Amino acid sequence: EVETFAFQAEIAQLMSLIINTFYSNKEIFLRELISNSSDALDKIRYESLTDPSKLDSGKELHINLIPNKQDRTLTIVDTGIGMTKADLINNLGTIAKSGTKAFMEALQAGADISMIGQFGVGFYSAYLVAEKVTVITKHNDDEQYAWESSAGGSFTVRTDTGEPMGRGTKVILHLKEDQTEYLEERRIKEIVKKHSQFIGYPITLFVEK
Ligand SMILES: Cn1ccc2ccc(C(=O)O)cc21
């Protein structure tokens, strides 16, 4: 049972800008997703301070980076607070309408796309390198869901009956054919070292057979 939704016009416009603007510094997508994971982990850690049972769905707070060259996917997994179905539908838990407004004003004033996270809409930088993004998520207060979009103005949401996640979010980047450098160990290590040095959770880069 798959529900298809239209993005809000402003978010479709954000996505089209990210996909169509010439802009070479695409590697910042990984910084932005890791920052989103860190923010999600901070949230479940805060809730656990007064309610330890919030970690019954998983005590370890971490981020895994999983490249798969056969599937052409880079997966960012975190064990943070996760998203409810409403969060997914409401722009993956962001205030993306007002964030997009500010971001586009900043761009016209001289900012560049690398500054997207300052506007709270860093998730959509995934579309710098991905033709399709799939988000699997599980919040303590809801079932497990899959969100997906190849842009083009719509996204889908379904209940996910696949591999159970415990708690947190998994962003599966189906990379564009010319962006496979982001599956290479040395390239991922370089970007994490450059941009994510002060993320306060373990970031494990999986290796491939
Ligand atoms: C890939 N994978 C790992 C654990 C697991 C459990 C269920 C399913 C499924 O498709 O139901 C897939 C799974």
Side-chain angles (χ1 to χ4, degrees):
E1 213 278 338
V2 179
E3 291 177 293
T4 305
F5 300 83
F7 290 109
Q8 293 177 266
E10 296 86 357
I11 283 60
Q13 190 179 1
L14 174 71
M15 291 171 84
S16 169
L17 179 151
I18 289 162
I19 289 168
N20 291 311
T21 298
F22 182 73
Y23 166 79
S24 295
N25 185 33
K26 291 178 177 285
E27 71 188 43
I28 62 94
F29 80 93
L30 185 56
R31 171 186 76 197
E32 298 305 323
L33 296 173
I34 288 172
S35 173
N36 285 355
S37 290
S38 179
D39 287 349
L41 287 158
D42 290 354
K43 287 173 197 176
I44 189 64
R45 178 172 280 151
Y46 184 73
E47 289 189 349
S48 80
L49 294 185
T50 60
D51 182 2
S53 78
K54 294 241 176 201
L55 297 176
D56 286 353
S57 45
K59 289 214 200 313
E60 197 196 337
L61 300 189
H62 64 218
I63 302 170
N64 294 333
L65 304 178
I66 309 176
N68 188 309
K69 288 176 185 79
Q70 296 49 220
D71 299 349
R72 208 202 298 160
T73 58
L74 177 60
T75 300
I76 299 91
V77 186
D78 66 67
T79 50
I81 196 162
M83 286 181 281
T84 65
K85 192 184 184 196
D87 288 331
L88 284 176
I89 291 164
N90 275 272
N91 299 309
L92 300 104
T94 67
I95 53 167
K97 188 187 163 130
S98 66
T100 295
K101 156 159 190 53
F103 181 42
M104 282 175 173
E105 298 177 335
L107 290 170
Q108 66 62 33
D112 64 282
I113 283 162
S114 79
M115 299 167 62
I116 185 169
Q118 292 184 46
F119 303 92
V121 291
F123 167 76
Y124 297 92
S125 68
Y127 289 91
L128 291 170
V129 297
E131 62 192 7
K132 180 168 87 189
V133 178
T134 309
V135 177
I136 316 296
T137 190
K138 175 64 175 73
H139 189 286
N140 285 334
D141 292 341
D142 213 340
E143 336 191 7
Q144 189 163 307
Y145 296 95
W147 174 106
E148 195 170 60
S149 180
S150 299
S154 67
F155 62 95
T156 60
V157 176
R158 54 165 172 92
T159 300
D160 182 33
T161 48
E163 182 178 10
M165 267 182 74
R167 185 200 59 253
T169 295
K170 157 167 47 183
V171 175
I172 306 172
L173 304 179
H174 302 268
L175 295 180
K176 293 161 184 176
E177 43 175 356
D178 66 341
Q179 300 302 321
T180 61
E181 70 191 77
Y182 300 108
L183 301 177
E184 298 170 16
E185 196 188 2
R186 73 192 181 161
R187 183 67 168 117
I188 298 162
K189 287 175 160 166
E190 176 187 46
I191 297 160
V192 169
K193 182 180 182 174
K194 177 162 176 204
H195 296 293
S196 302
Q197 210 65 93
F198 298 121
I199 298 295
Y201 296 100
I203 302 165
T204 300
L205 174 54
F206 286 33
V207 285
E208 299 178 66
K209 42 190 280 284

